[PDB]
Structure formats: structure tokens, C-alpha cells
PDB file of C-alpha atoms and ligand atoms in Angstrom:
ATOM      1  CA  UNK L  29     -16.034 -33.279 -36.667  1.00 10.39           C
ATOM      2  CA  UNK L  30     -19.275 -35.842 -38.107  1.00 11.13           C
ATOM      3  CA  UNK L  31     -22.201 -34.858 -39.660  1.00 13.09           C
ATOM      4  CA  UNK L  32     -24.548 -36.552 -37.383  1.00 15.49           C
ATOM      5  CA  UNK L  33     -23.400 -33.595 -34.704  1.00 13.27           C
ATOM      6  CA  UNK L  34     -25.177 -30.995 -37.282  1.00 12.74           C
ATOM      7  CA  UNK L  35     -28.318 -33.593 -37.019  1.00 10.41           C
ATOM      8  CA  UNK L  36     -31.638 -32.134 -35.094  1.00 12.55           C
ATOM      9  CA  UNK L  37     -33.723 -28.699 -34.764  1.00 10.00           C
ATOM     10  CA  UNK L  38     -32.335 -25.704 -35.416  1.00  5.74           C
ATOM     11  CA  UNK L  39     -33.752 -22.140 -34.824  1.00  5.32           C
ATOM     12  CA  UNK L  40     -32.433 -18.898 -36.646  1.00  5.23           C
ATOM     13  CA  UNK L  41     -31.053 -16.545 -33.959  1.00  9.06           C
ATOM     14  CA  UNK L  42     -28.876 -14.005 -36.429  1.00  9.51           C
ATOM     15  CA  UNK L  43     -28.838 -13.494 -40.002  1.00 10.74           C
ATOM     16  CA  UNK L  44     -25.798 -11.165 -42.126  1.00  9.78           C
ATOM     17  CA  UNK L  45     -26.325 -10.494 -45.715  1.00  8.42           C
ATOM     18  CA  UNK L  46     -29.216 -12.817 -46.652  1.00 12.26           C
ATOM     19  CA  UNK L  47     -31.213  -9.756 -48.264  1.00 13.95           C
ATOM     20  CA  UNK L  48     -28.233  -9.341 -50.678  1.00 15.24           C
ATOM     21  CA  UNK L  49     -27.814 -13.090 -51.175  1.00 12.82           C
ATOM     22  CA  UNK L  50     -31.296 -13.038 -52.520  1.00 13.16           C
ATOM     23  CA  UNK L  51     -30.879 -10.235 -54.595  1.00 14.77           C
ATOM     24  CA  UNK L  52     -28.153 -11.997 -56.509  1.00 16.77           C
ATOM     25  CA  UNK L  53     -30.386 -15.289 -56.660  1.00 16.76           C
ATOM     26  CA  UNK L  54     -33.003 -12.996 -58.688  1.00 16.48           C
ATOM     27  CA  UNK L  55     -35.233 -13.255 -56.107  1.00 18.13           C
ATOM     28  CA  UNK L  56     -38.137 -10.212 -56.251  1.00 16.97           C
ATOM     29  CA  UNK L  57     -38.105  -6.887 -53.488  1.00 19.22           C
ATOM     30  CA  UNK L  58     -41.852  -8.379 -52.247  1.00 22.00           C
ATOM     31  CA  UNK L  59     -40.522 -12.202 -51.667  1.00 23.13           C
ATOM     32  CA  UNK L  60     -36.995 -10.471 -50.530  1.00 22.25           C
ATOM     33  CA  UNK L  61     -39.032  -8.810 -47.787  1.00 23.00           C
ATOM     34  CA  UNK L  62     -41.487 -11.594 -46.805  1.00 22.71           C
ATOM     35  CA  UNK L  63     -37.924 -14.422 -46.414  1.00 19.24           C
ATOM     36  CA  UNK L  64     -36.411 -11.433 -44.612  1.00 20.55           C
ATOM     37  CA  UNK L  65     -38.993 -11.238 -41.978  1.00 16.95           C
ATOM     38  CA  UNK L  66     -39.418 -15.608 -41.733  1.00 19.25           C
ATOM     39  CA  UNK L  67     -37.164 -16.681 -38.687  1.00 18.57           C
ATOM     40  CA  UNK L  68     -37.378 -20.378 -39.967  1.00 17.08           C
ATOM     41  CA  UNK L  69     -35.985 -24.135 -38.101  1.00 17.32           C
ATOM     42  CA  UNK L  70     -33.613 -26.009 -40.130  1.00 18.76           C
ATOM     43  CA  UNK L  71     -34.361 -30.215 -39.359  1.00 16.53           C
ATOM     44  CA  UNK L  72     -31.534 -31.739 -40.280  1.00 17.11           C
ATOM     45  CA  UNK L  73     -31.094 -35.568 -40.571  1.00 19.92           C
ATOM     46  CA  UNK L  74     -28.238 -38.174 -41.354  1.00 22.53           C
ATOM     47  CA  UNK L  75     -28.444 -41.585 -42.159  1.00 22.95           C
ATOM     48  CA  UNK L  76     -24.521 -41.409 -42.168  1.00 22.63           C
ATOM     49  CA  UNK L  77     -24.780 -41.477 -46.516  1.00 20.92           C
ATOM     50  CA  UNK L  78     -28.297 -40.284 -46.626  1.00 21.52           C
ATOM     51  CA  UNK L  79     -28.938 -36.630 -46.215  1.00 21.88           C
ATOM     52  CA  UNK L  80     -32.418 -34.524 -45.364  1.00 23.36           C
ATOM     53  CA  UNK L  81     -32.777 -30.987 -44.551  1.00 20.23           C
ATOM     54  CA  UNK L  82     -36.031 -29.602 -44.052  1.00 20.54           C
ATOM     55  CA  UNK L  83     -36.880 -25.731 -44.024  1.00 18.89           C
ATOM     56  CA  UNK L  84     -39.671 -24.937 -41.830  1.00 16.66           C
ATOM     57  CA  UNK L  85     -41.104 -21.594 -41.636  1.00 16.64           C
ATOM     58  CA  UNK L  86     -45.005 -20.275 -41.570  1.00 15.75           C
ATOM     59  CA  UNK L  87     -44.357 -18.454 -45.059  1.00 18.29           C
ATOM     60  CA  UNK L  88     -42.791 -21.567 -46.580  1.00 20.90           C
ATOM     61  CA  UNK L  89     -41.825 -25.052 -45.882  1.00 21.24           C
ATOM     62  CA  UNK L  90     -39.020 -26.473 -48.512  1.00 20.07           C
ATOM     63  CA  UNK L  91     -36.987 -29.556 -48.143  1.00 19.73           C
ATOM     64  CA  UNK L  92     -34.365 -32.090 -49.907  1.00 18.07           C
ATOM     65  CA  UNK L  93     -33.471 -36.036 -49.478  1.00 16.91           C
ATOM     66  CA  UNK L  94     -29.812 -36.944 -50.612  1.00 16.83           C
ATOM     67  CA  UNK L  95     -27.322 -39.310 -51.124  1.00 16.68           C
ATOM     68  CA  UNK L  96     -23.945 -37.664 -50.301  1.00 17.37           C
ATOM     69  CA  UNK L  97     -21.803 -37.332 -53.193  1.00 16.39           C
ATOM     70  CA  UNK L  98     -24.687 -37.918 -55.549  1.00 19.39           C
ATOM     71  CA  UNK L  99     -26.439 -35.597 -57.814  1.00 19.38           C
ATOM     72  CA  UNK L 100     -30.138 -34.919 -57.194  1.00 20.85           C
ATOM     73  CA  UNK L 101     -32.936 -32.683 -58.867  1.00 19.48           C
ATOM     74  CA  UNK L 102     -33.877 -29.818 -56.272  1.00 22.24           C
ATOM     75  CA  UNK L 103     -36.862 -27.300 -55.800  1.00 23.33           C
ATOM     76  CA  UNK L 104     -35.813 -24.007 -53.825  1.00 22.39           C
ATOM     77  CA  UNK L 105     -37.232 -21.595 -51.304  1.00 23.20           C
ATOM     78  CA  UNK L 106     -37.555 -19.054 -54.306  1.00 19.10           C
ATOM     79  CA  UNK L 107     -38.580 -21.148 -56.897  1.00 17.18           C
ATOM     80  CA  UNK L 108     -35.307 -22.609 -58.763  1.00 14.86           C
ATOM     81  CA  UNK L 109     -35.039 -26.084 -60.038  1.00 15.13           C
ATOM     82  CA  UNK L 110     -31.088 -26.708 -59.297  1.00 16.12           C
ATOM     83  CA  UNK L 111     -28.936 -29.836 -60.085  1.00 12.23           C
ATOM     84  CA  UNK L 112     -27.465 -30.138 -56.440  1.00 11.85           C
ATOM     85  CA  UNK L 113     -25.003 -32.372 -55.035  1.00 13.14           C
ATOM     86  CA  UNK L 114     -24.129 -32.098 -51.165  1.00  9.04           C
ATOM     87  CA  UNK L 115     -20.909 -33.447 -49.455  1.00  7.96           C
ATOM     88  CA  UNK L 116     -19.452 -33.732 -45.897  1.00  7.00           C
ATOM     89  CA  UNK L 117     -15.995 -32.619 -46.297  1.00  5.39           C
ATOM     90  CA  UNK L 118     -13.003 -31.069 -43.958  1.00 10.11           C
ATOM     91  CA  UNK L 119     -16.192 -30.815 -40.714  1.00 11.25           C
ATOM     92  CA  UNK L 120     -18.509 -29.117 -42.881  1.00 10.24           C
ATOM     93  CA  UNK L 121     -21.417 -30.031 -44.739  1.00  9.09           C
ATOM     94  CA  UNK L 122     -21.106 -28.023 -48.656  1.00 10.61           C
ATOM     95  CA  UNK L 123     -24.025 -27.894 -50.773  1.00 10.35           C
ATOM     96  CA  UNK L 124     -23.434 -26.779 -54.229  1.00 12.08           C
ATOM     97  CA  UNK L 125     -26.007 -25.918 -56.341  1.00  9.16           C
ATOM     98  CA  UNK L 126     -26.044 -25.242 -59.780  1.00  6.53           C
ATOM     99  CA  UNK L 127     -28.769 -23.501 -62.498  1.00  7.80           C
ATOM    100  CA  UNK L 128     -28.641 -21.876 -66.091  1.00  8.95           C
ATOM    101  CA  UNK L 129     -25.533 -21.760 -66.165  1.00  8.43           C
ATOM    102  CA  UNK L 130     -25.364 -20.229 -62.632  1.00  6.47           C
ATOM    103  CA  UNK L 131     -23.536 -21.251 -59.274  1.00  8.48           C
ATOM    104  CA  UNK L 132     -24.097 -21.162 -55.520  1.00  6.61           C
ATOM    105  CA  UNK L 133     -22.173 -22.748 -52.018  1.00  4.01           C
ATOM    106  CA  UNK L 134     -23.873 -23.454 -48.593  1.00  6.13           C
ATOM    107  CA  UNK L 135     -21.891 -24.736 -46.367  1.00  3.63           C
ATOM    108  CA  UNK L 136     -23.142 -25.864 -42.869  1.00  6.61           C
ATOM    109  CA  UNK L 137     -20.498 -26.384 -39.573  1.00  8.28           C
ATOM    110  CA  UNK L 138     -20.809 -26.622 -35.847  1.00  6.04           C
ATOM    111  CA  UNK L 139     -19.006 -23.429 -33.979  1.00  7.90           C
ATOM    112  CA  UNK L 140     -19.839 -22.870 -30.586  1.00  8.07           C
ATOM    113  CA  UNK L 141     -22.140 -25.908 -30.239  1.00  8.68           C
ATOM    114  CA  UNK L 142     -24.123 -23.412 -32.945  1.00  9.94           C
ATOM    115  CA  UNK L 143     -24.866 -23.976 -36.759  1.00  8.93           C
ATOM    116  CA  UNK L 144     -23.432 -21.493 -38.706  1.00  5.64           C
ATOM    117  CA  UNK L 145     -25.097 -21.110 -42.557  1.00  6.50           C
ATOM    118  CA  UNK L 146     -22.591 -19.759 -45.360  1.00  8.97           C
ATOM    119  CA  UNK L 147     -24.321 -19.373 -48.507  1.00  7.46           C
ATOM    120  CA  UNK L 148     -22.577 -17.759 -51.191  1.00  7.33           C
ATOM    121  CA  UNK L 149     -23.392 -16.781 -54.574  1.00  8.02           C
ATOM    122  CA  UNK L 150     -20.757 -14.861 -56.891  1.00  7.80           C
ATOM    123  CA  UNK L 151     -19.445 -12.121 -54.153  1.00  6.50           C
ATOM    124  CA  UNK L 152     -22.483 -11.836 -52.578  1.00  3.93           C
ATOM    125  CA  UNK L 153     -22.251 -14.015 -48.983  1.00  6.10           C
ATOM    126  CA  UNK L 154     -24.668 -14.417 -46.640  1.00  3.20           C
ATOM    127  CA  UNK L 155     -24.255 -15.949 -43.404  1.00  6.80           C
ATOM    128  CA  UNK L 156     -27.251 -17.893 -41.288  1.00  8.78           C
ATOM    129  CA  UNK L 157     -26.798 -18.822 -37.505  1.00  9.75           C
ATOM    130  CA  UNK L 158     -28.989 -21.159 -35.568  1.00  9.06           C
ATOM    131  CA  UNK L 159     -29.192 -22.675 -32.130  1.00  6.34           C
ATOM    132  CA  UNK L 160     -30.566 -26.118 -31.466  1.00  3.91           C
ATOM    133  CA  UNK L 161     -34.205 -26.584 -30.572  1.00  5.38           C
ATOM    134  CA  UNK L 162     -33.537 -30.446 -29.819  1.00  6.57           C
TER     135      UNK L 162
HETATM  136  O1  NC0 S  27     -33.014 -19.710 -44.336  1.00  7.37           O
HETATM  137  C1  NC0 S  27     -31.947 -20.255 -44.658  1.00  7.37           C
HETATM  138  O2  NC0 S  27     -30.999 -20.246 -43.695  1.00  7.37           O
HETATM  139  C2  NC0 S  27     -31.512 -20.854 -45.914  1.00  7.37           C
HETATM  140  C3  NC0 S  27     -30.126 -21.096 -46.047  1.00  7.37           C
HETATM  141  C4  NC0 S  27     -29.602 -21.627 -47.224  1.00  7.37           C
HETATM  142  C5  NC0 S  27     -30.464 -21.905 -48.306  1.00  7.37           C
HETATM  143  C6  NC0 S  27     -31.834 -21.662 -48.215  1.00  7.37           C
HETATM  144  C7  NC0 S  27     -32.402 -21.141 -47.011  1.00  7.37           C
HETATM  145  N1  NC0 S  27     -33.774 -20.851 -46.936  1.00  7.37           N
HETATM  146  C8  NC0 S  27     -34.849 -21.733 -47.182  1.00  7.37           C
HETATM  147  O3  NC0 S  27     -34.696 -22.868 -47.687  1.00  7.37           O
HETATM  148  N2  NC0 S  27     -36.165 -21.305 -46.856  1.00  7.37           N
HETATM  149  C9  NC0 S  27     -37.363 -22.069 -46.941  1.00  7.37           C
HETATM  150  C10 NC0 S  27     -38.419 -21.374 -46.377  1.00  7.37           C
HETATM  151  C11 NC0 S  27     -37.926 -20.058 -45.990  1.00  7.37           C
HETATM  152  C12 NC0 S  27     -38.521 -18.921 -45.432  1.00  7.37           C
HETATM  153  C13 NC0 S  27     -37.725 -17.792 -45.182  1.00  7.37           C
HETATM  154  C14 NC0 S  27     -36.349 -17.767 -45.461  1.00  7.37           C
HETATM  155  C15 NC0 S  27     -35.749 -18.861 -46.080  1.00  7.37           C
HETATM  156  C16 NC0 S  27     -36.507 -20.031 -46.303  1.00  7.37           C
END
């Protein structure tokens, strides 16, 4: 696998478990609900090293430049201000992001020529799946 095959538009299609995932993230029952009912695109870009991944929804827009392997400052959906580092290992892209003391793993791979969204967060996982827009 490379990471410049996860590279483009993506639209949400199916979601498992992101309701609890946000639970666990302290996220509020009214912002819960709103993110629940978003069906976002994910643009993703790769300048090989260089990493951005863009959130688009009509709710909320959110989005993060990186260096793989490096350390950055990042603001979330829900309003968290993580220390985040992101890494292309063993064909996936793994985002770990870390907060008062607190930890959470997405991890973004190609399966069926469809990006499939793993975000976990103590036991709580939630899994994302979108299909290319271009
Ligand atoms: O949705 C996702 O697959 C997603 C996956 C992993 C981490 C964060 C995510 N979500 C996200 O960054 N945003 C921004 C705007 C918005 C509206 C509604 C639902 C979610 C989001």
C-alpha cells in the first residue's frame, strides 16, 4: 500500500459506533446528535512527508497540516486542543492523539477501493467508511 492512494474526496456512506466514540471523548448529548446527523467529505492530501486532512461538513469544517512523524498542536471537531502526531505505517495511515492525560487512535486504510475510519478511544471504537468523490 502508499498513502498517496488514500489522497482525494471522500464521502461518508456508513458509520458504526461514532455516537459512543463521542460519548467517551466527553462530547455533550446536543453536539452528539448534531455530528450524528453531519454526513461529512474527508479531503485528504499527501505531499509524500507532508500530511492534510480536511473535514468538511455544513455543521463544521475542521482540518490539520502535518509532517509525518512529527508532533503538531491540533484543534478538534469537538473542541479539544490535542498534541497529535500522524504516521503511515504497515498500509495504514494512524493518527494518535493525545490530551489531559487522555488517549485516542484513528487509523485510515484502503479496503475495497473504500476508506475505512477506525477511531478508538479506551474500548469504545468507532468505525467511519467513505467512498471517493474524486
Ligand atoms: O467524521 C469523521 O469520520 C471523523 C473521524 C475521525 C476523527 C474526527 C472525525 N470528525 C471530524 O473531524 N468532523 C469535523 C466536522 C464534523 C461534523 C460531523 C461529524 C464529524 C466531524
Amino acid at each position: 500500500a502508499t498513502v498517496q492512494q488514500l489522497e482525494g474526496r471522500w464521502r461518508l456512506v456508513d458509520s458504526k459506533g461514532f455516537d459512543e466514540y463521542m460519548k467517551e471523548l466527553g462530547v455533550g448529548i446536543a453536539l452528539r446528535k448534531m455530528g450524528a446527523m453531519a454526513k461529512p467529505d474527508c479531503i485528504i492530501t499527501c505531499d509524500g512527508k507532508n500530511l492534510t486532512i480536511k473535514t468538511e461538513s455544513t455543521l463544521k469544517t475542521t482540518q490539520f497540516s502535518c509532517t509525518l512523524g512529527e508532533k503538531f498542536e491540533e484543534t478538534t471537531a469537538d473542541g479539544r486542543k490535542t498534541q497529535t502526531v500522524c504516521n503511515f505505517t504497515d498500509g495504514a495511515l494512524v493518527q494518535h492523539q493525545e490530551w489531559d492525560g487522555k488517549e485516542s487512535t484513528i487509523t485510515r486504510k484502503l479496503k475495497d477501493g473504500k476508506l475505512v475510519v477506525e477511531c478508538v478511544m479506551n474500548n469504545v471504537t468507532c468505525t467511519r467508511i467513505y467512498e471517493k468523490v474524486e
